[PDB]
Amino acid sequence: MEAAHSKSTEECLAYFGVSETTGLTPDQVKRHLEKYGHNELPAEEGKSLWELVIEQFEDLLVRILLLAACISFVLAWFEEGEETITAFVEPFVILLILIANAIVGVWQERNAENAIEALKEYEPEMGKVYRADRKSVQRIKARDIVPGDIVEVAVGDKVPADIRILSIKSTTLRVDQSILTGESVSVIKHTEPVPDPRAVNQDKKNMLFSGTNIAAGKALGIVATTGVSTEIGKIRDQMAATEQDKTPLQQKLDEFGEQLSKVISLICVAVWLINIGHFNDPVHGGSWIRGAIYYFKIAVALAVAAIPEGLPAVITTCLALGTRRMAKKNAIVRSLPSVETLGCTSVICSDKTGTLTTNQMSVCKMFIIDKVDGDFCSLNEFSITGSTYAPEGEVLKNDKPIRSGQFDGLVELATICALCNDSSLDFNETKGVYEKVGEATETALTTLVEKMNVFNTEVRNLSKVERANACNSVIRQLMKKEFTLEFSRDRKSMSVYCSPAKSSRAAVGNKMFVKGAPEGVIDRCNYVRVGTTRVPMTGPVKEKILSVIKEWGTGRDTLRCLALATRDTPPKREEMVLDDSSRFMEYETDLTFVGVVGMLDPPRKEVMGSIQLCRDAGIRVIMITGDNKGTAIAICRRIGIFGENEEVADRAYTGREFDDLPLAEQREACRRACCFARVEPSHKSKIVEYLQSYDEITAMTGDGVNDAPALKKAEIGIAMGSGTAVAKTASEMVLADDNFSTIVAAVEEGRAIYNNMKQFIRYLISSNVGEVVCIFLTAALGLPEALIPVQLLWVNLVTDGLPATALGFNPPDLDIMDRPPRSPKEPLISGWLFFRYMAIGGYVGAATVGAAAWWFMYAEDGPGVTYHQLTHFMQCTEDHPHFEGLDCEIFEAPEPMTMALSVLVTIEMCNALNSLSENQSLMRMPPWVNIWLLGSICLSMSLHFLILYVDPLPMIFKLKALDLTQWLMVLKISLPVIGLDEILKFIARNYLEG
Amino acid sequence: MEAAHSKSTEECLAYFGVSETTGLTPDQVKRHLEKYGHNELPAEEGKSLWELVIEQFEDLLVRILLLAACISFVLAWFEEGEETITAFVEPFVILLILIANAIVGVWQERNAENAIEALKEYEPEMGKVYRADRKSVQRIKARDIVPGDIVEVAVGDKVPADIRILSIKSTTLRVDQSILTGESVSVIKHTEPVPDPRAVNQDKKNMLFSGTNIAAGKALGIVATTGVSTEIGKIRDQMAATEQDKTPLQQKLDEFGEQLSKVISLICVAVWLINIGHFNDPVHGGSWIRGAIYYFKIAVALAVAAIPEGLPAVITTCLALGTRRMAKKNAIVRSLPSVETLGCTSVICSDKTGTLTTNQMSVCKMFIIDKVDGDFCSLNEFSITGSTYAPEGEVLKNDKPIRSGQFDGLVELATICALCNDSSLDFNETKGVYEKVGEATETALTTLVEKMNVFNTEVRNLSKVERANACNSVIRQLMKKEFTLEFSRDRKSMSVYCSPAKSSRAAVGNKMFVKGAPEGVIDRCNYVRVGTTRVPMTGPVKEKILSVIKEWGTGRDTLRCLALATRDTPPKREEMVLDDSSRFMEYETDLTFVGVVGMLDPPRKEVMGSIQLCRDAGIRVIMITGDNKGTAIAICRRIGIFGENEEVADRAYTGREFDDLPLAEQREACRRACCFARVEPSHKSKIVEYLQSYDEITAMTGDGVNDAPALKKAEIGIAMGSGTAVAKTASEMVLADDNFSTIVAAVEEGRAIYNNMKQFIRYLISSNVGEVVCIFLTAALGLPEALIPVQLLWVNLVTDGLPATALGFNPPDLDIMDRPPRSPKEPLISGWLFFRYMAIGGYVGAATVGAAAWWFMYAEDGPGVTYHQLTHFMQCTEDHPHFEGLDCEIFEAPEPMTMALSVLVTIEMCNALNSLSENQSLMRMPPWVNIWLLGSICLSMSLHFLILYVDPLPMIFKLKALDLTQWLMVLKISLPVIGLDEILKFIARNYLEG
Ligand SMILES: [Ca+2]
Ligand SMILES: [Ca+2]
Ligand SMILES: [Ca+2]
Ligand SMILES: [Ca+2]
Ligand code: NA
Ligand code: NA
Secondary structure (H helix, E strand, O other), rough: OOHHHHHHOOOOOOOOOOOOOOOOHHHHEEEEHHOOOOOOOOOOOOOHHHHHHHHHHHHHHHHHHHHHHHHHHHHHHOOOOOOEEEEEEEHHHHHHHHHHHHHHHHHHOOOOOOOHHHHOOOOOOOOOOOOOOOOEEEOOOOOOOOOOOOOOOOOOOOOOOOEEEEEEEEEEEEEOOOOOOOOOOOOEEEOOOOOOOOOOOHHHOOOOOOOOOOEEEEEEEEEEHHHHOHHHHHHHHHHHOOOOOOHHHHHHHHHHHOOOHHHHHHHHHHHHHHHHHHHOOOHHOOOOOOOHHHHHHHHHHHHHHOOOOOHHHHHHHHHHHHHHHHHHHEEEEOOOOOHHHHOOOOOEEEEOEOEEEEOOOOEEEEEEEEEOOOOOOEEEEEEEEOOOOOOEEEEEEOOOOOHHOOOHHHHHHHHHHHOOOOOEEEEOOOOOOOEEEEEHHHHHHHHHHHHHHHHOOOOOOOOOOHOOOOOHHHOOOOOEEEEEEEEEHHHHHHHHEEOOOOOOOOOOOOOOOEEEEEHHHHHEEEEEEEOOOEOOOOHHHHHHHHHHHHHHHHHOOOOOEEEHHHHHHOOOOOOOOOOOOHHHHHHHOEEEEEEEEEEEOOOOOOOOOHHHHHHOOOOOEEOOOOOOOOHHHHHHHHHHHOOOOOOOOOOOEEHHHHHHOOOEEEEHHHHHHOOEEEOOOHHHHHHHHHHHHOOOOOOOOOOOOOOHHHHHHHHOOOOEEOHHHHHHHHOOOOOOOOOOOHHHHHHHHHHHHHHHHHHHHHHHHHHHHHHHHHHHHHHOOOOOOOOHHHHHHHHHHHHHHHHHHHOOOOOOOOOOOOOOOOOOOOOOOHHHHHHHHHHHHHHHHHHHHHHHHHOOOOOOOOOOOOOOOOOOOOOOOOOOOOOOOOOOOHHHOHHHHHHHHHHHHHHHHHHHHHOOOOOOOOOOOOOOHHHHHHHHHHHHHHHHOOOOOHHHHHHHHOOOOOOOHHHHHHHHHHHHHHHHHHHHHHHHHHHHHO | OOHHOOOOOOHHHHOOOOOOOOOOOOOEEEEEEEOOOOOOOOOOOOOOOOHHHHHHHHHHHHHHHHHHHHHHHHHHHOOOOOOOOOOHHHHHHHHHHHHHHHHHHHHHHHHHHHHHHHHOOOOOOOOOEOOOOOOOOOOOOOOOOOOOOEEEEEEOOEOOOOEEEEEEEEEEEEEEEOOOOOOOOOOOOOOOOOOOOOHHHOOOOOOOOOOOEEEEEEEEEEEEHHHHHHHHHHHHHHOOOOOOOOOOHHHHHHHHHHHHHHHOOOOOOOHHHHHHHHHOOHHHHOOOOHHHHHHHHHHHHHHHHOOOHHHHHHHHHHHHHHHHHHOOOOEEEEEOOOHHHHOOOOEEEEEOOOOOOOOOEEEEEEEEEEEEOOOOEEEOOEOOOOOOOOOOOOOOOOOOOOOOOOOOHHHHHHHHHOOOOOOOOOOOOOOOOOOOOOHHHHHHHHHHHHHHOOOOOOOOOOOOOOOOOOHHHHHOOEEEEEEEEEEEEHHHHHEEEEEOOOOOOOOOOOOEEEEHHHHHHHOOOOEEEEOOOEOOOOHHHHHHHHHHHHHHHHHHOEEEEEEEEOOOOOOOOOOOOOOHHHHHHHHOOOOOEEEEEEEEOOOOOOOOHHHHHHHHHOOEEEEEEEHHHHHHHHHHHHHOOOOOOOOOOOOOOEEEHHHHHHHHHHOOOOOOOOEEEEEEHHHHHHHHHHOOOOOOOOOOOOOOOOHHHHHHOOOOOOOOOOOOHHHHHHOOOEOOOOHHHHHHHHHHHHHHHHHHHHHHHHHHHHHHHHHHHHHHHHHOOOOOOOOOOOHHHHHHHHHHHHHHHHHHHOOOOOOOOOOOOOOOOOOOOOOHHHHHHHHHHHHHHHEEEEEEEEHHHHOOEEEEOOOOOOOOHHHHOOOOOOOOOHHHHHOOOOHHHHHHHHHHHHHHHHHHHHHHHHOOOOOHHHHHHHHHHHHHHHHHHHHHHHOOOOOOOOHOOOOOOOOOHHHHHHHHHHHHHHHHHHHHHHHHHHHOOO
């Protein structure tokens, strides 16, 4: 259904044979999902610069190599000597091991795409539509919204698909189409036919357009077009394929991959040029062409092993999987590139109400006069858990929960905080939260009595709809409120003339319960209560209570202390004036003290951790608050941003003081601020700009229309769930919680994937470094080349493949969020790490030929033992009076080859353990942190073992099984990759950081 | 232990710490078997001329082909188009299907060597040696006789290993060393030290030498040397490796294999030259080098399939396995080449006593006067089964067995043939046969009474040692022999004065039982017996009995008729002269008739079949007999060599009449003779020579010393078991039975393997013929080449491999021994068969592209249907207004390729059924004759099916699964290989033979 604008509210609906007040059937939803695809853009090709120069380069290596194996193969049939078996075997295995690589490489890749599919269950839904399944509007992915369904559209919403305006439901229907038509003034629409078919978006003021914003109103409609069929999609088609927007890492990796097109080809082509003096040896029949083919294999097969492969897909597995865990704890990050920015964001300019604080008012502590003797008193405090109007909370004592019932005062305390309350609690069947029924400061008195559950009403098996008011609606049936003296500036307090419920007696148990502010009330409290008795309010006692009330408003808490009181013997109502607020000061004097609570707007759950944890990781946090300069600061000292005692009157800000200062002060002050109180709605952008002009990376949260401007500008703009969709469009991350903490749970994750990437390669590079110098070293001095092409391929399958895959399945390093951030322009390899790269290589390659040389040279319980010169070994037949009871041929045997190639594989395995944590010890991050690695190891052990102790199998790779006595030398020479690397950690972690 | 001649009977034995009267231990027998190998020559290399030019030629084809697949493979990475999958797959499969050939080829070969091992259980043993296991001499293979054991050595024996003469056991010890030292006079040895170490065989007249003959005597000794350590072995070392003695077939096969180095390379190199106009087509990207590589694969991969492979080992499996069955029924043929001569031997100059006849005398029929009325009589005959002195025989009546007891006459008949008998039967515990105890003509009277078992003694559970004389030793206790009138020329008869055993009465039951020749006795028979009574011997009755006696000596039987008689009332012994032979004619007159038997020297078991069966197969048989001219002929008319009535007095021979005739008569007469009576011991050679000068192939049997000269000269000299080892050396086949029949059971087998060889290839050639023209035909006319290299390899694995293997596991054709012999110079392929070769090919190749062409052309229930021109198909894009609703690309689809290649495989399978019998119909030799073929078929069906209906698998070979409707067309086009070939049989079998 195209251009449904030419068509009115009847000819439209009937197109898909469907009535607005019903929608489309599930079978139909299928067909349109099948015939029009999804409501999204096409799949862009992720062909990297590494994929061209490295991945496929290998895919040439493996083939020309093989080609060569069939060159020499073919000439074998023309050899006059002995009909061989092992040479004949080679090309078979050549092919049969390279296929094993494909059993690995493609499998890693499939898990990659499986992981991306996994994410497709968390991708944020912002599209309310009417369907046939439910008799009510349903949530659904924007892409998944087929063209035909009655898309619902409200204040601030983002229109996912091209909707023909069917029925206008608000009084007006305007649409901010600044994204396309272009104007910061929205436009009035209507629901009628636009007869002329050829026109511009402007003149179609009877339809929503996919990607436009809702400035105001609410309507309904029908989807004309989706995906590429979209109007903006036809414009966005230009930006789709033709582009050049690689991220910084995506420029490193490949400048890091293309430099290896130099290294690899260079070194290995040189591994040919170095063996020029071995192109007419008798091992190759003294043939000047049959040799050069073989030393074509040595270089190339060493290359294959040298080339790190599987990276493109591994970072997919890593990145994606990390975005899964980000998504799981409500860090909703769409664009995967957003992690690379998410992980270096060193600043978090976030919001307060709903993000740093729960909004929901909550009573902290509250106390009763515990003992009164000698005009002196001890107080009885009771902290309440939780922070919400949901009664999900429990009273305390010294951080030890106890039943308020055990204290008679609290049983009066709640009676005042349940009766003396012109407000209530409610549960929401549609939403599922507890929302206040009145004013929050008074809602907190509903909250509290419920939590305490003084008289212990049975609520464990009582309904949500009864729980929100379980205790209160019991307290209410024990007493009566006869008339309320409303809260009065005069006395900074309220009161209620109560009385015993279900009564027969007239003036026998009426209790004028007061409530409100400290002094105002305490100045009218002449008696003190203890348990169920009374005693004259004393000097030092008064001063104890009021000093402790001074305490909470003094301390970092800053709990709004609210005194509560009782008049014992109330006066006659007939006598009492009922209609003049100023009479109440005579009607509220001479009270009996009961208690004084401390209540506040608490912080959001697990922020108090997510505030210190980030300061450690080199993150500069800022609140964008609405409270006044003073009171905003009190909230930022309540949490942790400011400390109890630490002068900061240079750092707090309000709009007055912000537009005053000269441009530079507005910049200079901004690189050192924490709190933006009463901040005008345009300030947010100017801040960002300034913060950015300090190379600092922003993390703005948002919600109401006028946040997009900042969010779009910042690097990771965030949005609120209850915040509109205009903002979830302009953002990079959507806090599906609203919380500051969930942003942290995101930066901390997005960082983790960065540390796993820097290891997955650290293993490959360092390990494969040694492998090539493992031919240089021996070829330099004269030592034998204790390898053959297949053995060089063997090292590639064993080491580069599966343990590599397990390095991308790693937990978080201990020091995930203590270390400073990466400034995005800092390269992929650092000097000390670059040494650490070649250092680790230096050794794992030196151990390899070592183990081979140890056999010929200083052998234990073995044949030969020639500790003297092994360099000019090719002159052994020239001068034979040097050896002592051993043939010159001995060095062509598979015994040393076994050892070294066994040490080559053995040592790179524990090199992954090293690579488990970039900086934390094997004691600190043991091998069992990663079970997926400890599996990868044993596997290859089975495999590598398997090709030693299966008759024909070793014969294939030219090896020999080893006695117990010999597999011990493997440990003494392989373990040192632990001690070696572990020493590296000690230098970086202590001297280079910390 | 070398040169044990320098050492006497003490210093010798002690060498191996062993005492002559004990020998060597089983553990020692191990060690010497291990340290000195076997007592035989080395293993000669069977490297054929086909192995050089065909087997290994293929082993080059498969490699340069593969090489090519990695040439084009490598350039794929440099192709600008689309990243393919199926081309990338190819080289993998290339290697992976050629390996499948090796799963076949080598497996056929292993069964080959397993079969040869199987024969090593039947190889004839001629070496009696003293060992520790048994306290007596043991039989053992000559090769298996280690050096050390006390080798026993008798009259005529062949000394297997170098024996030091320890203890001379005969009165003299001579040794015929004509084979080495050289002299037809043997040499006296002794048992003492030959002090001078350097000397010639002659001067060591104290030792046996391996390969020399025993002229006379018997001794014992100790083995100095074995195998190459032998003296003749050191001389035979010259004849071992360096030689040139290929058999006629072995010259055909390879002149037949090297001609295919022309055919194969030629045709297939031409299959490249014909596609020169396809080296710049868009299918190959218009590239002038990328194409030529592919049409290198078409030719070569067609070659591979063309080359018949597995033949060298199959003929091993066939030949060997046939030699197994030859060995099983006692045709002991050593040299495997001896079959190739065994199968064309069209003459069988064999022996009589022990070979054509059982030697053992045997009574045929025998009769009683059944009725006597009116001077006339009817006779009651009783044929006896078997032919041996072993009582393994049963009486008959009209070829219906009945108990002689039911006839009273026979109960007297045996009484005369048990009592009147100066001879007996015996069993041999050491040998296990029944050997006579007296003269055979009289032994037959022991034999007979036992067989009859008249009075029915319980013998079913009586010992062998009691059975040989079970009845007789019962008859003997019913009567008494008082004195024997010995057999007398006078009366041509013997008699015994009997009497009732355990008697008290004197002249009351004495019975003078006579025995002997017809007339002599019957002329003294005045009474006749019937049942238990008497009646005067009559004229016509007498003449009935004597005419019937005239009958058996007249008929081809020629049974020595021997009349038996009884004197009822004997005269007084006191009166009777006891000491004058001439008195017995008065003492034997007036007898009572009882019966007259017919007895003879019967033929050997299953000769009467093996005489007619061979005359059919074009075999000219001759007896070398000792009987006189007349009586020798009677034996050769008794069997079948001569017919009842057929004048042959021109064809029978005796030595008198043989050395008389002039050389040419001795030649001219010899190409037409059957019986050589009283033949001087040198005649045998002169015969051979003459028979050979008629291009005829001899099959001389032998036994006594002076047979080797003939046997060595003849083509398949044979030997007797009981015949000495001098003869088992000079022979080519050893009759482990002695029988003429077992020679037949050998020629008939040795022939069978010849017919199986001529089919195993008939399948390959004919089938693979069509395959190559299957590219010529279509390339000639312009049709598409409905194949690709892998498909050409597929045909080679499916068809050439396993069904081929099953063609060598075939039963005997109905017409195994009716058809004439192959004269050894007649080639491997005959004109009509050569047509039949290309005829069958002509069609099985024409069916293949047919089925492909039927798809494009005249299709049923299929897409396309272009019955018009398909030749200039490459001009379809040039001129596109010709097609009707189909793309020009349609012809590159896998649909026709599937069909044809499916017909290519389908039709060659039933081509093996054809090949089951060279000339006998599917009705005559149904497919279920060979279960090993009917297995081979289903297998490949599973395989071929499997690569159509397994998603990726067909995609690999570029094929498509077929609907039921389509696998029906396969039958209608494949079955005709039956009807086609079956018509060939009808022409050859009837018009060209029969
Ligand atoms: Ca690699
Ligand atoms: Ca590696
Ligand atoms: Ca073949
Ligand atoms: Ca074939
Ligand atoms: Na942004
Ligand atoms: Na011979």
